[PDB]
Amino acid sequence: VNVPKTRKTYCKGKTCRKHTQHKVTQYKAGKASLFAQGKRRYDRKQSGFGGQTKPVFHKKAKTTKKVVLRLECVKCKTRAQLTLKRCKHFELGGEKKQKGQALQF
Amino acid sequence: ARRPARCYRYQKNKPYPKSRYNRAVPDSKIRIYDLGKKKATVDEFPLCVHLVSNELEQLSSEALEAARICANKYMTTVSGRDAFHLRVRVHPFHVLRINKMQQGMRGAWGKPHGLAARVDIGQIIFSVRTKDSNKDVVVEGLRRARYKFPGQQKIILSKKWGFTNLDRPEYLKKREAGEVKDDGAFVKFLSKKGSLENNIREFPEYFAAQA
Amino acid sequence: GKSHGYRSRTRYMFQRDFRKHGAVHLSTYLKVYKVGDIVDIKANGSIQKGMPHKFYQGKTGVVYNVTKSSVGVIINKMVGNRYLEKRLNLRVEHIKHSKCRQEFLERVKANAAKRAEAKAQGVAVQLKRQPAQPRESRIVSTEGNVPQTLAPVPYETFI
Amino acid sequence: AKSKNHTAHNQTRKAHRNGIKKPKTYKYPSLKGVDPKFRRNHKHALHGTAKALAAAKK
RNA sequence: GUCGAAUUUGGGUAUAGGGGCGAAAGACUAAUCGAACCAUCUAGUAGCUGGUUCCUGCCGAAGUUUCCCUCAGGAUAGCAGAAGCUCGUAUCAGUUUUAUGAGGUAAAGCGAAUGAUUAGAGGUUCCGGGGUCGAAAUGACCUUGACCUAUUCUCAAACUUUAAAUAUGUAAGAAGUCCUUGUUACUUAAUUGAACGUGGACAUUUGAAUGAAGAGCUUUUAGUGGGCCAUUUUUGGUAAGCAGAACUGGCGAUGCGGGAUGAACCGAACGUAGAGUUAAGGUGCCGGAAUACACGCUCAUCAGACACCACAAAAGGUGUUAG
RNA sequence: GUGAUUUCUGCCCAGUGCUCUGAAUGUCAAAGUGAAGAAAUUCAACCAAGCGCGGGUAAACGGCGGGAGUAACUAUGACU
RNA sequence: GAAGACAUUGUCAGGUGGGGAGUUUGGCUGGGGCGGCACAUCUGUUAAACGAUAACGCAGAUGUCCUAAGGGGGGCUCAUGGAGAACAGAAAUCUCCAGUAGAACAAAAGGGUAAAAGCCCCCUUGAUUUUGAUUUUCAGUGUGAAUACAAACCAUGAAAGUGUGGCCUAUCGAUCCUUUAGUCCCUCGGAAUUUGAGGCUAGAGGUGCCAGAAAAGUUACCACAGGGAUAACUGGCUUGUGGCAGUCAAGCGUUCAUAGCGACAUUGCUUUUUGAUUCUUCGAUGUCGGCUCUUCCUAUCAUACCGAAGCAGAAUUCGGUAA
RNA sequence: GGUUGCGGCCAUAUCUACCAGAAAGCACCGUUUCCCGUCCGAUCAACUGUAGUUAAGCUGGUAAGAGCCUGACCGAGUAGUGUAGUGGGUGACCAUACGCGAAACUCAGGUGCUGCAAUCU
Ligand SMILES: COC(=O)C[C@](O)(CCCC(C)(C)O)C(=O)O[C@@H]1C(OC)=C[C@]23CCCN2CCc2cc4c(cc2[C@H]13)OCO4
Ligand SMILES: [Mg+2]
Ligand SMILES: [Mg+2]
Ligand SMILES: [Mg+2]
Ligand SMILES: [Mg+2]
Ligand SMILES: [Mg+2]
Ligand SMILES: [Mg+2]
Ligand SMILES: [Mg+2]
Ligand SMILES: [Mg+2]
Ligand SMILES: [Mg+2]
Ligand SMILES: [Mg+2]
Ligand SMILES: [Mg+2]
Ligand SMILES: [Mg+2]
Ligand SMILES: [Mg+2]
Ligand SMILES: [Mg+2]
Ligand SMILES: [Mg+2]
Ligand SMILES: [Mg+2]
Ligand SMILES: [Mg+2]
Ligand SMILES: [Mg+2]
Ligand SMILES: [Mg+2]
Ligand SMILES: [Mg+2]
Ligand SMILES: [Mg+2]
Ligand SMILES: [Mg+2]
Ligand SMILES: [Mg+2]
Ligand SMILES: [Mg+2]
Ligand SMILES: [Mg+2]
Ligand SMILES: [Mg+2]
Ligand SMILES: [Mg+2]
Ligand SMILES: [Mg+2]
Ligand SMILES: [Mg+2]
Ligand SMILES: [Mg+2]
Ligand SMILES: [Mg+2]
Ligand SMILES: [Mg+2]
Ligand SMILES: [Mg+2]
Ligand SMILES: [Mg+2]
Ligand SMILES: [Mg+2]
Ligand SMILES: [Mg+2]
Ligand SMILES: [Mg+2]
Ligand SMILES: [Mg+2]
Ligand SMILES: [Mg+2]
Ligand SMILES: [Mg+2]
Ligand SMILES: [Mg+2]
Ligand SMILES: [Mg+2]
Ligand SMILES: [Mg+2]
Ligand SMILES: [Mg+2]
Ligand SMILES: [Mg+2]
Ligand SMILES: [Mg+2]
Ligand SMILES: [Mg+2]
Ligand SMILES: [Mg+2]
Ligand SMILES: [Mg+2]
Ligand SMILES: [Mg+2]
Ligand SMILES: [Mg+2]
Ligand SMILES: [Mg+2]
Ligand SMILES: [Mg+2]
Ligand SMILES: [Mg+2]
Ligand SMILES: [Mg+2]
Ligand SMILES: [Mg+2]
Ligand SMILES: [Mg+2]
Numbered sequence A: 001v002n003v004p005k006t007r008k009t010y011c012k013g014k015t016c017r018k019h020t021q022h023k024v025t026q027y028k029a030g031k032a033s034l035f036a037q038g039k040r041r042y043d044r045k046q047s048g049f050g051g052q053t054k055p056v057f058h059k060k061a062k063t064t065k066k067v068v069l070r071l072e073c074v075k076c077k078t079r080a081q082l083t084l085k086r087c088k089h090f091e092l093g094g095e096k097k098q099k100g101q102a103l104q105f
Numbered sequence B: 001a002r003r004p005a006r007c008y009r010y011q012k013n014k015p016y017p018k019s020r021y022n023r024a025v026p027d028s029k030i031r032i033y034d035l036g037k038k039k040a041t042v043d044e045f046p047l048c049v050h051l052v053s054n055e056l057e058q059l060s061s062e063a064l065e066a067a068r069i070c071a072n073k074y075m076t077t078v079s080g081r082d083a084f085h086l087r088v089r090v091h092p093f094h095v096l097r098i099n100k101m102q103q104g105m106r107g108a109w110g111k112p113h114g115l116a117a118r119v120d121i122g123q124i125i126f127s128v129r130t131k132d133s134n135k136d137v138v139v140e141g142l143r144r145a146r147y148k149f150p151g152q153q154k155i156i157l158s159k160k161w162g163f164t165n166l167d168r169p170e171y172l173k174k175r176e177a178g179e180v181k182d183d184g185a186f187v188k189f190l191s192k193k194g195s196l197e198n199n200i201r202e203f204p205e206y207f208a209a210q211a
Numbered sequence C: 001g002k003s004h005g006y007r008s009r010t011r012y013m014f015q016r017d018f019r020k021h022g023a024v025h026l027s028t029y030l031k032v033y034k035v036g037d038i039v040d041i042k043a044n045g046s047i048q049k050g051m052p053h054k055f056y057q058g059k060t061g062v063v064y065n066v067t068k069s070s071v072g073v074i075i076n077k078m079v080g081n082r083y084l085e086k087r088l089n090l091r092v093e094h095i096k097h098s099k100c101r102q103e104f105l106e107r108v109k110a111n112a113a114k115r116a117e118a119k120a121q122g123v124a125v126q127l128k129r130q131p132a133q134p135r136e137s138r139i140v141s142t143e144g145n146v147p148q149t150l151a152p153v154p155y156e157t158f159i
Numbered sequence D: 001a002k003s004k005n006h007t008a009h010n011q012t013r014k015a016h017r018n019g020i021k022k023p024k025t026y027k028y029p030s031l032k033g034v035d036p037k038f039r040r041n042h043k044h045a046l047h048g049t050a051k052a053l054a055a056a057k058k
Numbered sequence E: 001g002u003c004g005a006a007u008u009u010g011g012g013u014a015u016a017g018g019g020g021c022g023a024a025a026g027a028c029u030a031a032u033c034g035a036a037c038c039a040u041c042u043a044g045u046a047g048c049u050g051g052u053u054c055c056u057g058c059c060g061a062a063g064u065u066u067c068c069c070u071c072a073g074g075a076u077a078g079c080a081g082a083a084g085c086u087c088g089u090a091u092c093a094g095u096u097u098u099a100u101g102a103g104g105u106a107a108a109g110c111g112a113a114u115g116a117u118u119a120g121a122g123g124u125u126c127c128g129g130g131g132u133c134g135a136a137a138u139g140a141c142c143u144u145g146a147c148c149u150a151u152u153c154u155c156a157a158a159c160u161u162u163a164a165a166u167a168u169g170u171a172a173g174a175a176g177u178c179c180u181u182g183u184u185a186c187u188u189a190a191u192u193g194a195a196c197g198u199g200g201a202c203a204u205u206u207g208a209a210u211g212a213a214g215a216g217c218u219u220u221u222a223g224u225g226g227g228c229c230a231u232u233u234u235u236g237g238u239a240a241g242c243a244g245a246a247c248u249g250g251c252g253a254u255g256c257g258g259g260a261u262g263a264a265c266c267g268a269a270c271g272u273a274g275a276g277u278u279a280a281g282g283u284g285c286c287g288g289a290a291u292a293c294a295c296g297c298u299c300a301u302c303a304g305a306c307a308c309c310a311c312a313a314a315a316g317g318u319g320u321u322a323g
Numbered sequence F: 001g002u003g004a005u006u007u008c009u010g011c012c013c014a015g016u017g018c019u020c021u022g023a024a025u026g027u028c029a030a031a032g033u034g035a036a037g038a039a040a041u042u043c044a045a046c047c048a049a050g051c052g053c054g055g056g057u058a059a060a061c062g063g064c065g066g067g068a069g070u071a072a073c074u075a076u077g078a079c080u
Numbered sequence G: 001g002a003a004g005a006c007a008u009u010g011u012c013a014g015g016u017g018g019g020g021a022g023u024u025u026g027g028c029u030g031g032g033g034c035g036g037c038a039c040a041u042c043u044g045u046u047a048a049a050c051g052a053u054a055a056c057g058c059a060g061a062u063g064u065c066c067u068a069a070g071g072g073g074g075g076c077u078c079a080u081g082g083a084g085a086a087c088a089g090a091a092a093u094c095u096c097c098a099g100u101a102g103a104a105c106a107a108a109a110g111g112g113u114a115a116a117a118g119c120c121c122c123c124u125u126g127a128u129u130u131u132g133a134u135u136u137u138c139a140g141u142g143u144g145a146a147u148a149c150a151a152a153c154c155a156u157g158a159a160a161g162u163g164u165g166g167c168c169u170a171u172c173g174a175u176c177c178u179u180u181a182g183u184c185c186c187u188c189g190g191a192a193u194u195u196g197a198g199g200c201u202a203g204a205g206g207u208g209c210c211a212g213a214a215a216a217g218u219u220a221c222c223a224c225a226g227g228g229a230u231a232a233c234u235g236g237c238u239u240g241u242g243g244c245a246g247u248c249a250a251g252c253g254u255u256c257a258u259a260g261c262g263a264c265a266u267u268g269c270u271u272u273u274u275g276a277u278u279c280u281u282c283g284a285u286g287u288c289g290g291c292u293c294u295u296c297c298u299a300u301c302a303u304a305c306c307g308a309a310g311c312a313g314a315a316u317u318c319g320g321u322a323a
Numbered sequence H: 001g002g003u004u005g006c007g008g009c010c011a012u013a014u015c016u017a018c019c020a021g022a023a024a025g026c027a028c029c030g031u032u033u034c035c036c037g038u039c040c041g042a043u044c045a046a047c048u049g050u051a052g053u054u055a056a057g058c059u060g061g062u063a064a065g066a067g068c069c070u071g072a073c074c075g076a077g078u079a080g081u082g083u084a085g086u087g088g089g090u091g092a093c094c095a096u097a098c099g100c101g102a103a104a105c106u107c108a109g110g111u112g113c114u115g116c117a118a119u120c121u
């Protein structure tokens, strides 16, 4: 797909509480952090002997990932997520589809 | 390597035509269905004799063909190639399947094996038209063809004028009138419905109601 | 594998009636529905929104709701050895008023009449319906009608 | 070892031992799933005429 | 086989169980070896196999749904028992009738659409090609193709205008019908409407049939979750005492009479007995019951003899019978 | 490993191993170092063997092709 | 004497480590295996005109694609064909007539659509925010998908309106954990500030065996619980294949259908072929061949007596009664 | 009765060919300053109602017309079907019994009905 880098849409931010312009961008996970309670508990669990103490996933099936757009109200600063269908090529550059032109050269 | 007809005599399955859905199916062994003087006029051949099924069954295309050759062969050499008109009245549109043959009964769907006409009781298989003075000769044709077919069929003298839809007098009454007009090998009748104008054009020899 | 989607098996059922395609005539929308109204259900394949599922085709129910472009019909579907209550949000293009009660209402309005029209005369009413009774005696005449005598016919072939 | 696949055999026999229970009917059925704008108003409508009928036995 | 040596052999001594020892066979390690023997953990676990102990009375199944590393097992719903409880001419129905819907199967159709298919006939080309005249021609004339017109023979599970039977939704009133005119924040131009009402009018021919050893409701629990068969509908298969669906009725769980025999056919469903009458099937003798009555037919140097059922076909006969 | 004698033991180090007076700026642990922070901590640089790169090795494990044409009958194919 | 703060040793840290340990090494399936996917799904048919409905039934499809191919508005009419216009031809671009959709609407197919649902243009983000109800599958759970409202905020249009993604019927995902968005909210339990951690609400990272384990082989050295729910041997049903026999008679046979043969067709029998099946046996019915010996069948090779011949004789061939 | 604007059922309203249409109305029709749209004032926009015409639209009538609608003991109680039997038949299939019952065919009849508002010899 191709989606626009901007978006007039609902902002639910106490002051905003109306349709405003959002700057659009793609969600990107976030560094791990040990000290997460889970990572904490895991780390312990894996000490000493016994080997892998927890399942390790192998039977991968999907060949994609749902895109998440981060929508940022340029007034009230707040953000909203909005998640697209599965697609195999994503871009929020542009190059918009064009009228009815020739196949070149 | 053809299976015995025995294996397909009865109408056990639903009509399996050649279709988008079927496709790879062999040719019908019988391909001509009108032989003898088929160009001939309706007036030429008054008498009409039929080969008529007495069974709900299935005739192979191969036995259709063999029969066809048998009767035409006889009818010509005994009474000439222009004596008669033989119409195979039955077309083999139903495809018969075969489970040709690691596996066994797992996934057993046949491949097309051959064609067959499916035929009612009372259903006409062959029809012949001639001159009255040939009756015997024709009936002997259909009698011999019979030996080519599973199941009982019986030969029946028509009341009709040739391949026409009219018994002998009613055609005559219609003809010695004005109403009939020659076509290719069949005929056209004057309708009382439709445009008076181009109805009068056609059939000039009506519209006096006499000769 | 098998297939069992929402509109599966509905080829002819949501089909459109010979020479009757296109816009729906405007009376379909001028018709008015109140709660308690009995409607019959029939999908209009031309109208994809607000469609009943196939099972509810040819079913009669009672309106329980009236919204902008729809009525809510409640049908008793019997799943198992029992009925459950099912509620259908149908657009008005898939619903029509049933005549399943017209004969009842015509019957009642009329039963009120000959009930008063009898009482205010001198009783003697009789207004339950009765089934077809056997017919009575009668005398058929020959005058102008002597019995024609038919026999069975021989066997003949014509073909 | 393949075995049977499906049958409805005998199932309506069972269905009929203990019913096909008819559908059960009530005066005053639930307003469940009724238009909220209606229902909101209808409430006040009812509250009112209630007050009116206490007002008849003052 | 070998028999003076890589010979045989006593005793003593060392090597010990994932260890030994092995000129190597997974051999040998006390009748134990692809991991010895002894005790213990230990009554190891077992969706698998076996067995499970008195009588009578009443009721009485399932082999199906959905989920499961699920397919010889479980959970879940169903079927079953129990205990009842609230009520009672009430309300109830594997049924009809009446009124009103739904449906695209059977049939039918194809000189109606789509798709197939046999045949000619008549047209039309500045134009698919051939051939004669030709300098050619948007030339003429034959010709065979395609198309067109009106006809003709034949077809469809995945075609169709039409369109059954059987099945199938709803309705047949007191929770009803009519009048008067309150409430609201919904809704209307509008006290307009919508919903819910207050007050008033009409009783069992109060609104079809037939039935009802009553109706309604609650809790909890077993077994079952291999099914098989018959008529009809029906898929795969040449077919099957084969494989798989639909509806009902069965067998399984069930004896009794009949089909000699036999799970499922026909008759008929079981407390102990008397008398009577029957069913299906029989009545020469076996064998209870007419070697009954009547009209034909049939003579077989492999006659025939009663559903399911325990097979026979094309084709023939100057045997005989009636047409 | 192979298996008396006689004879003879061809070519292949790409792979898998094994191996090396080899190279070096690639990856690379704990400790140690530096940087930020109020510290817990985060980031960074440096970095052993190993890996990777390079060389050796077949009496290590093992391997040791396909399609056309071509000589005065045909056939064959030294030859391409 | 040698060696020397180096070895050695002790604790962590990386490499190596089938030498050894422990464990695992899908399901359905006309046995299992190889294959395929009937394992989660969609269209049409099977499907027996409501609904439901099986097989490794039939013909196809799904793990995607689209900022427009989503939303609103206006304008327009498609496939095809006829007739016309320089180069220009079968096919370029221009016009007019006809045109029920014979087109197009991403994709399988089926529905659906004509001042549109198709084509061209204009303006856009409703593909958004909140939390419930409902329909399909159903246990009347979940998930997917969908429907009609309520409360917002918007888009478009003169407006009525329409818009909660793609015309409809498929296009997908629990708990634990991580991660992000959200209010600036609750907690860290002796009291505070600040980091940090933990909660709440909504998303993403995925389980395709799709209600969702973390998983390689070999065993002929083999083991146990079971299975006749299941193969290999006998037996049963079937008889496609094999084998054997007919009917018709176009032909063959110098001439001449049938002396002897016999095409195209077509009806059968047989159960020493091989298949199909899986009903009996898995707490065991001794598998091939031969030897020995008995008995049976006849579709007769010889031998007895016959009939026929394209029987001169001789020899042969065909047929009968014959085991 | 005509006509117009808005309609409802959506062919008895459609299609093919020809003829007829008073009056009003519709219409065709004139113009390009203005709003507005085009390659083109053809469509679309505006202005005149003046300059012109029933030719076309429109309405109606004709036609052994095409189509479509309705009817009928026309075909047919046919096909098909629910129920029954220890009915026939080697089978394939087929009669019978108590019911339900088509489609094509054939023949006749028909060719828009009508609501609100305004207008009209
Ligand atoms: C494949 O061969 C076997 O299975 C042989 C045997 O072990 C026969 C040996 C039996 C004893 C040990 C008793 O000899 C056996 O189990 O026989 C079964 C057996 O053993 C008693 C009886 C079986 C099954 C019914 C009769 N049949 C005969 C013998 C046999 C022969 C086979 C066969 C199976 C049978 C079985 O498959 C191929 O050939
Ligand atoms: Mg620790
Ligand atoms: Mg913030
Ligand atoms: Mg049949
Ligand atoms: Mg079949
Ligand atoms: Mg096999
Ligand atoms: Mg096979
Ligand atoms: Mg297959
Ligand atoms: Mg296949
Ligand atoms: Mg015959
Ligand atoms: Mg005809
Ligand atoms: Mg399907
Ligand atoms: Mg239309
Ligand atoms: Mg939608
Ligand atoms: Mg199994
Ligand atoms: Mg089985
Ligand atoms: Mg089962
Ligand atoms: Mg051990
Ligand atoms: Mg040890
Ligand atoms: Mg011992
Ligand atoms: Mg020993
Ligand atoms: Mg125990
Ligand atoms: Mg033990
Ligand atoms: Mg098990
Ligand atoms: Mg009982
Ligand atoms: Mg699982
Ligand atoms: Mg068992
Ligand atoms: Mg009922
Ligand atoms: Mg259907
Ligand atoms: Mg049919
Ligand atoms: Mg037919
Ligand atoms: Mg028809
Ligand atoms: Mg057709
Ligand atoms: Mg059909
Ligand atoms: Mg009923
Ligand atoms: Mg009653
Ligand atoms: Mg009673
Ligand atoms: Mg009682
Ligand atoms: Mg229970
Ligand atoms: Mg239970
Ligand atoms: Mg199960
Ligand atoms: Mg259970
Ligand atoms: Mg039975
Ligand atoms: Mg049992
Ligand atoms: Mg019994
Ligand atoms: Mg008995
Ligand atoms: Mg018997
Ligand atoms: Mg019976
Ligand atoms: Mg005896
Ligand atoms: Mg006796
Ligand atoms: Mg007597
Ligand atoms: Mg019989
Ligand atoms: Mg005979
Ligand atoms: Mg005779
Ligand atoms: Mg070596
Ligand atoms: Mg050796
Ligand atoms: Mg050595
Ligand atoms: Mg050499």
Ligand SMILES: [Mg+2]
Residues within 6 Å of the ligand: none
């Ligand atoms: Mg070399």
Ligand SMILES: [Mg+2]
Residues within 6 Å of the ligand: F013
């Ligand atoms: Mg090498």
Ligand SMILES: [Mg+2]
Residues within 6 Å of the ligand: none
């Ligand atoms: Mg470090």
Ligand SMILES: [Mg+2]
Residues within 6 Å of the ligand: F015, F062, F063
């Ligand atoms: Mg190698």
Ligand SMILES: [Mg+2]
Residues within 6 Å of the ligand: none
């Ligand atoms: Mg030191």
Ligand SMILES: [Mg+2]
Residues within 6 Å of the ligand: G017, G018
């Ligand atoms: Mg190791």
Ligand SMILES: [Mg+2]
Residues within 6 Å of the ligand: none
């Ligand atoms: Mg191991």
Ligand SMILES: [Mg+2]
Residues within 6 Å of the ligand: G027
């Ligand atoms: Mg398996």
Ligand SMILES: [Mg+2]
Residues within 6 Å of the ligand: none
């Ligand atoms: Mg398995």
Ligand SMILES: [Mg+2]
Residues within 6 Å of the ligand: none
């Ligand atoms: Mg197999």
Ligand SMILES: [Mg+2]
Residues within 6 Å of the ligand: G035
């Ligand atoms: Mg496989």
Ligand SMILES: [Mg+2]
Residues within 6 Å of the ligand: G038
């Ligand atoms: Mg299955």
Ligand SMILES: [Mg+2]
Residues within 6 Å of the ligand: G039, G209
């Ligand atoms: Mg599965």
Ligand SMILES: [Mg+2]
Residues within 6 Å of the ligand: none
């Ligand atoms: Mg159905």
Ligand SMILES: [Mg+2]
Residues within 6 Å of the ligand: G052
């Ligand atoms: Mg279901």
Ligand SMILES: [Mg+2]
Residues within 6 Å of the ligand: none
């Ligand atoms: Mg489509």
